[PDB]
Amino acid sequence: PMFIVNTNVPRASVPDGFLSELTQQLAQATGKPPQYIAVHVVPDQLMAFGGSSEPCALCSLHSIGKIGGAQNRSYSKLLCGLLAERLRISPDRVYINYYDMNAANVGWNNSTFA
Amino acid sequence: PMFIVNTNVPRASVPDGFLSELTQQLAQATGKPPQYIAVHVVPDQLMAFGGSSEPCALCSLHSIGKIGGAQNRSYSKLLCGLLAERLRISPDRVYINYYDMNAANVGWNNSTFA
Amino acid sequence: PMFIVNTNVPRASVPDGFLSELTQQLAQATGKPPQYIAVHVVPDQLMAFGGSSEPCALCSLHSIGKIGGAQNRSYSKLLCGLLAERLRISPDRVYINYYDMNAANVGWNNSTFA
Ligand SMILES: [Cl-]
Numbered sequence: 001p002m003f004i005v006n007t008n009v010p011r012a013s014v015p016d017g018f019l020s021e022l023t024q025q026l027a028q029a030t031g032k033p034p035q036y037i038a039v040h041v042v043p044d045q046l047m048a049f050g051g052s053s054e055p056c057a058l059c060s061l062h063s064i065g066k067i068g069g070a071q072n073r074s075y076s077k078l079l080c081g082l083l084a085e086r087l088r089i090s091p092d093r094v095y096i097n098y099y100d101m102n103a104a105n106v107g108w109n110n111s112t113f114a
Numbered sequence: 115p116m117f118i119v120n121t122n123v124p125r126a127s128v129p130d131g132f133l134s135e136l137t138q139q140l141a142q143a144t145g146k147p148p149q150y151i152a153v154h155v156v157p158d159q160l161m162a163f164g165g166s167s168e169p170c171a172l173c174s175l176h177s178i179g180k181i182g183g184a185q186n187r188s189y190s191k192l193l194c195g196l197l198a199e200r201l202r203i204s205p206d207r208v209y210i211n212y213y214d215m216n217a218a219n220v221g222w223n224n225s226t227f228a
Numbered sequence: 229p230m231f232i233v234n235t236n237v238p239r240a241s242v243p244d245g246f247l248s249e250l251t252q253q254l255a256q257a258t259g260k261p262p263q264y265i266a267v268h269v270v271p272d273q274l275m276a277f278g279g280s281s282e283p284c285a286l287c288s289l290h291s292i293g294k295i296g297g298a299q300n301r302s303y304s305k306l307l308c309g310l311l312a313e314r315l316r317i318s319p320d321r322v323y324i325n326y327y328d329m330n331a332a333n334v335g336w337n338n339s340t341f342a
Contacts, residue, residue, distance in 0.1 A: 019276040035278040048133040050149040069218040076221030096221030107304030107324030162247040164263040183332040190335035210335030
């Protein structure tokens with residue numbers, strides 16, 4: 001699993017330990033071992049959501065499996081919860097794109113997960 | 115709908131109001147309310163297009179439906195049009211990836227659009 | 229083909245000609261003319277892999293065709309190799325997302341590739 005968040009919230013407002021918290025919570029939620037969970041946070045972005053420049057985030061979660069209707073609802077509650085608590089972003093100003101990747105379409109370690 | 119533009123054009127060359135213009139025009143093009151539209155512009159990128167570092171752009175448009183052969187041609191004309199006029203990027207140095215998303219795979223407001 | 233690299237490796241650690249080298253290698257590897265190849269490198273990123281902030285990379289390769297099990301393995305060896313040699317990133321801290329797009333879902337020059 002890889003989780004990326006793009007946000008217009010400034011760098012200074014991202015708290016120490018945010019990447020590790022994202023890692024642990026995602027390991028928990030997705031089942032997958034934390035050793036292979038990747039996370040990318042991108043602050044200070046030039047964005048608008050609904051035409052407004054109030055705090056917002058555009059995110060993506062890529063996973064080999066563990067993507068589905070019920071699971072995705074659960075991930076969003078988790079991730080929106082984190083973004084609201086740690087970055088003060090309203091959950092209704094967050095979009096998260098979910099990608100169910102084929103193992104053959106994910107490269108890692110000079111090869112793929114196929 | 116969410117639209118992301120990555121470009122090697124400098125921040126100073128992004129005109130005031132560009133994010134609002136993208137929002138308004140995407141609302142018109144997709145027929146969705148501007149309130150749902152998210153836009154993200156990323157200037158000053160380290161990019162090459164065809165081995166050249168003249169102005170270029172790599173973009174994506176994520177939508178739940180409203181994606182298709184004819185509609186995407188219409189989006190490209192519109193968005194290339196804006197990138198040329200506002201950022202002075204030649205349309206033939208623009209790639210736009212279109213994603214037709216399932217509602218179940220778009221998180222928002224602690225849930226999904228399903 | 230579009231190739232994007234996101235990495236926590238510093239900018240100054242990205243060698244001159246890395247974009248050019250990416251372009252030629254990708255041209256050779258995909259059989260596509262260098263004129264069609266786009267490359268995007270994003271250094272200095274706030275990222276973690278396996279909870280660790282040691283050098284790592286999150287990448288994607290978008291192409292119309294030329295994507296599949298065997299092909300993606302060869303790409304992964306090629307690109308991890310280039311990341312290891314040029315950016316000193318361990319192959320086992322690299323993810324590459326492969327996207328096989330329909331020509332109709334790639335915008336370019338006021339239209340699509342369809
Ligand atoms: Cl989808």
